[PDB]
Amino acid sequence: GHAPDKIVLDHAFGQTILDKKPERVATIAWGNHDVALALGIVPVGFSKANYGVSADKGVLPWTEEKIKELNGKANLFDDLDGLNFEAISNSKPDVILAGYSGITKEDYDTLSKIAPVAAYKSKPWQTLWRDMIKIDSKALGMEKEGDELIKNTEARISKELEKHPEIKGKIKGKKVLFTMINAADTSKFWIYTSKDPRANYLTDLGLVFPESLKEFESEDSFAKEISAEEANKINDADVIITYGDDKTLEALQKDPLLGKINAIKNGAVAVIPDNTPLAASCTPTPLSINYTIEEYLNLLGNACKNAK
Ligand SMILES: O=C1CCC(=O)N(O)C/C=C/CCNC(=O)CCC(=O)N(O)CCCCCNC(=O)CCC(=O)N(O)CCCCCN1
Ligand SMILES: [Cl-]
Numbered sequence: 001g002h003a004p005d006k007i008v009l010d011h012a013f014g015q016t017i018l019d020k021k022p023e024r025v026a027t028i029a030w031g032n033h034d035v036a037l038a039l040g041i042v043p044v045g046f047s048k049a050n051y052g053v054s055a056d057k058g059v060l061p062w063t064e065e066k067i068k069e070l071n072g073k074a075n076l077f078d079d080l081d082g083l084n085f086e087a088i089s090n091s092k093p094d095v096i097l098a099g100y101s102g103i104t105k106e107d108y109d110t111l112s113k114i115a116p117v118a119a120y121k122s123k124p125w126q127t128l129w130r131d132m133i134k135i136d137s138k139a140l141g142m143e144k145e146g147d148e149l150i151k152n153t154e155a156r157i158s159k160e161l162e163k164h165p166e167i168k169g170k171i172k173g174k175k176v177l178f179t180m181i182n183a184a185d186t187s188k189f190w191i192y193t194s195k196d197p198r199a200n201y202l203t204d205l206g207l208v209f210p211e212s213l214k215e216f217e218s219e220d221s222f223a224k225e226i227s228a229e230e231a232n233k234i235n236d237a238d239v240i241i242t243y244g245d246d247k248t249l250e251a252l253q254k255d256p257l258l259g260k261i262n263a264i265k266n267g268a269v270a271v272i273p274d275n276t277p278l279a280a281s282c283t284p285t286p287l288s289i290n291y292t293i294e295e296y297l298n299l300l301g302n303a304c305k306n307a308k
């Protein structure tokens with residue numbers, strides 16, 4: 001029969017060429033294994049999740065669910081402390097997926113000696129969920145199936161919003177900032193920029209970014225650390241999203257500086273329970289979205305009710 005053409009990947013570290021569809025697939029960093037799994041491929045090895053589950057388990061629920069539905073088993077790399085090059089070698093992969101990753105040039109070179117690497121396009125950790133699918137699925141020789149995975153995922157998002165008309169209308173057009181605010185040390189906090197997939201995902205849910213975000217937008221990173229003394233700059237946000245717990249909101253409202261911020265003052269804050277599957281899903285994968293989007297929308301919806 002007719003064999004597939006060769007695959008040319010243009011990424012941040014140059015170019016990667018595959019001559020056939022890889023049968024043995026390794027993935028690293030975050031989420032890339034879910035792209036392979038959503039395409040019906042069980043990886044010969046992938047990185048332990050360093051967020052959302054105990055280190056003992058190391059695998060997120062939607063990821064584990066798909067694996068068992070494929071009658072496969074989870075082969076985890078012991079790489080919570082950093083890339084485990086030997087473990088990757090032992091898996092004998094034909095390709096290494098890293099479309100969403102923070103690997104360095106040094107990392108890429110070592111990995112490429114093991115197997116062809118699908119790296120990110122621009123800067124570390126600056127890959128949006130659609131682009132993550134595009135990169136990873138192309139490297140698997142499943143570019144066409146990848147475009148259909150994107151289509152079906154976009155459809156799942158849209159249908160879920162349609163299931164909750166009140167929430168959809170409530171959050172539509174609301175100005176949002178995804179942040180990391182620690183109620184313990186409120187002297188400074190993080191704001192994730194539009195280059196970050198967990199911020200971009202919010203625009204898929206119907207929300208928009210305030211114009212103040214542009215000031216913090218840059219080529220540097222996916223997140224910007226700003227002082228609490230500059231908190232007035234984000235008064236144009238209707239709703240603020242941050243990781244935290246059941247004591248976070250009240251602590252922020254009682255903060256002398258942060259408590260003056262409109263969204264915080266109004267209670268228009270979506271607190272995502274830190275180190276839970278829900279929290280981990282905020283940087284979306286095709287598997288995570290289907291698993292958590294309804295719970296996510298309920299938090300966002302409740303926060304946007306307090307928005308003026
Ligand atoms: O390796 C990660 C772990 C979980 C993660 O970083 N998160 O942001 C999820 C919520 C984090 C929880 C508690 N962690 C830490 O608070 C520290 C600061 C932190 O993670 N931030 O996002 C703050 C801006 C970052 C510091 C730059 N650090 C890096 O560039 C690493 C990737 C980084 O910190 N990025 O956020 C890119 C993310 C790949 C998403 C998940 N992979
Ligand atoms: Cl509703």
Ligand SMILES: [Fe+3]
Pocket residue numbers: none
């Ligand atoms: Fe982070």
